[PDB]
Design a protein around this ligand. Sequence first.
Ligand SMILES: [Ca+2]
Ligand SMILES: [Ca+2]
Ligand SMILES: [Cl-]
Ligand SMILES: [Cl-]
Ligand SMILES: [Cl-]
Ligand SMILES: [Cl-]
Ligand SMILES: [Cl-]
Ligand SMILES: [Cl-]
Ligand SMILES: [Cl-]
Lengths: 458, 459
Amino acid sequence: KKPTNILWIYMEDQNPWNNAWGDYTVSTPNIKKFADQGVRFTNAHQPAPVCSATRSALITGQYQTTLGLQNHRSSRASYNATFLPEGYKTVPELFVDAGYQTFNIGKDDYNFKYDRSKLYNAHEGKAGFQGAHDGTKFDWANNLKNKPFFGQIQLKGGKHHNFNGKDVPQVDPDKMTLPAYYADTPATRAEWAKHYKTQVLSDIELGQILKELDDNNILENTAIFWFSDHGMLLLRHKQELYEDGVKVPLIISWPAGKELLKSKGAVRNDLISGLDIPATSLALAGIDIPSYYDGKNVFSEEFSGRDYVISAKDRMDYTFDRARSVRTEKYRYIRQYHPPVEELYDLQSDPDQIKNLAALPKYKKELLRHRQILLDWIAKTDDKGAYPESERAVKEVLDIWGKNCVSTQCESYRLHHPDSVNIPGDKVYSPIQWPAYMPKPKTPYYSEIEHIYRKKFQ
Amino acid sequence: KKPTNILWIYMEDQNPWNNAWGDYTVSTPNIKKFADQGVRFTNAHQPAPVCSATRSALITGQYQTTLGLQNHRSSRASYNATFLPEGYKTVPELFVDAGYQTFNIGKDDYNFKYDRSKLYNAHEGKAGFQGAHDGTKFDWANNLKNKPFFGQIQLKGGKHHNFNGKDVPQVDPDKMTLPAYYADTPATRAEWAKHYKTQVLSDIELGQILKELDDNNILENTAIFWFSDHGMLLLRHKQELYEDGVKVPLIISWPAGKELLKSKGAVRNDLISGLDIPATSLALAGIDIPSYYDGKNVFSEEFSGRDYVISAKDRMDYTFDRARSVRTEKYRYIRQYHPKPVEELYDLQSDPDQIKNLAALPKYKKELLRHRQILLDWIAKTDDKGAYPESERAVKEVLDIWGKNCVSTQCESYRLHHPDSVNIPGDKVYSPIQWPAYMPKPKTPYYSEIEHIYRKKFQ
Ligand SMILES: [Ca+2]
Ligand SMILES: [Ca+2]
Ligand SMILES: [Cl-]
Ligand SMILES: [Cl-]
Ligand SMILES: [Cl-]
Ligand SMILES: [Cl-]
Ligand SMILES: [Cl-]
Ligand SMILES: [Cl-]
Ligand SMILES: [Cl-]
């Protein structure tokens, strides 16, 4: 007994502030019922805290840092490209090869060049934001009611802008409880109340998708993976609060396999990586997990929870950072490469990560233990974050963010190209030819997504 | 029940033309007795056919192509550097961390920068050929007769230069049987007879090392790995004959453990990769094999022979090539990326000298695709770094060492984009590379000498 379909309900930028996680600030009945009849994961940690890093990792099955996909965003311009290795199979291509129809409605946002028709064969792509391909809308639930499919639906999550729907409650910014030692201003309180409203919008959209499956008798045989690509990125001065940036909601539901999925627990507290989502998707559908994928089937009998979960943060827009985190059952550890410098937090007693324990003698052994888990991971994956981005990749940042990039990478680039700082890179550098094993489609939007230069930023 | 020591008897550039392999052209009694009492491997295929590629692969435990170590030679200059990832453990470091004394007498010839004292803690290094470190000679068999060690002794193998020893037999070039369609000249017949003489020199040297171990009671408790870094590189026009380039002699002997080793066969014909040598050494000494190593323990109960062995060839001195090979039980497949890639398929049973390319024969289409798919899996799994062009700084290193001999497109384009500095030494053109914080560069003087690789004689 395997499900017929896989469906990822893929939310942008959302923390699990919903009834199923015990939070009754707003009413989330669809999510609560959905969680009650499925498997809820309370320790699912994505490999990255930002869009294109997480989304590239889950679609390739590996840490975004292993294949040079770690920088948000990257490989978008005509003159700067990353290609997956020859022979490589993304998760959708694995499903296509096994006979399924595949789609992703909404943004891809991956940090490599690709022929989308090899990944998603049930619909066409179109130009998206900042070099991304997007998947066109279509009546997937009707068209594929009798064709086994791996689909994704991208929902706006915390980035929903429109709250005029008569089902969105009032949320008073003055009633919001902020994290400890977090900036308490009208703007942060407004961001909190807005994020609660987006929980209701997510709850509504979940209800609509479940109805659409039900109206085409697709609800029983579809394994649904319900998750966000990261939580809200929160800053206390310069300190990123990683725990609730990488820990995301995850509910897995397969109605006709309920008892099989719940066998290890209807509420899973063991440590899960977001990279286990594609691997579990493959296993549930009866597709081998490639040996080079990092994920595991979280429902297999041999799966007893990860000892630790690794996350990575690299460049974000025009901020050239590099940090690596080891999450164990009790601690989050951070290695910060651009303050060498280390952080360690006991989450049980310090959930907002205020008390760095790295320099306390009592915690030296736990510190070294987390550090060594990280060194093992760097040695195993050859973390491409250790290597600097190229001239062409820096030029791509300049095309998109212009004067906003004040990093020493960007200034040094300007000092070396004073003749062309504001000339679009596609007029400075030759286009990158796609490799023999993957010719560039002639589809017109493939050239439109490469027009990344933004005059308004210089 | 584990051996106490690990020793690699490590030969340069040598084919198994010896009595243990059934070749009595010359007398090799030490090798014959050694193979008789140990385990002989007839299908051991190195991951490369040249020195720095094979040697970097075995010392790191991974295909040289996975870590950017594939180009022979590379990362030698002051301005061009490859470092292993933070936290990475080469095989000697794994033995140091476990308490052993470690040494390699003779050349290292690795394509990355390293602090040799972290690898080999039982002796010092010295300047070597073309940017390599070498290990100084010392009385290892006595110094370490009571200290568990992992050691390597580098022997000259097919590159021995002096044949006046009174026990080197005369070998007639006119009696040499060359490979089918191989150039039949006085030079190649001379090379054949010379190579047979080097078999006797390797036989002598094997006897001496065994005597040193016996004189110090190290003979019983020492697992020895006796092998070469590759066979001779043979060309027929532009075609490299990979089968006998990568397949090397390998004998493993551990006299106190004879019966355990021989359990799966005293003569082993299953497919083995040279990367299984460090993995098997680690296993015998009771050290964990890191999850990122490619080798396996060939004496483990779970080891049932490899279904295939991968080999890779990339730049060789100033020849910028890229070829990948899948060896299966019956066939060797070659994918050639700079002839878009062209493919070769040979049935070795009927075509030992690799003359009849079967790749375009409809009868062999399925065997072709099956070998192609094996290679594609390996590229996807390892992100074969030969898919990426060498940097500007690496081309300069080639130009420094080889000068006007490099006629490649990469070189000729470099000369076009730097017409004013073509013959200026690279260390006056490019700034030195700072070693990473996790591995500071020793002050030791020969570390500066080995980076002086410019050769005026070549331009
Ligand atoms: Ca996002
Ligand atoms: Ca050699
Ligand atoms: Cl825009
Ligand atoms: Cl649309
Ligand atoms: Cl299972
Ligand atoms: Cl604009
Ligand atoms: Cl040489
Ligand atoms: Cl003859
Ligand atoms: Cl075993």
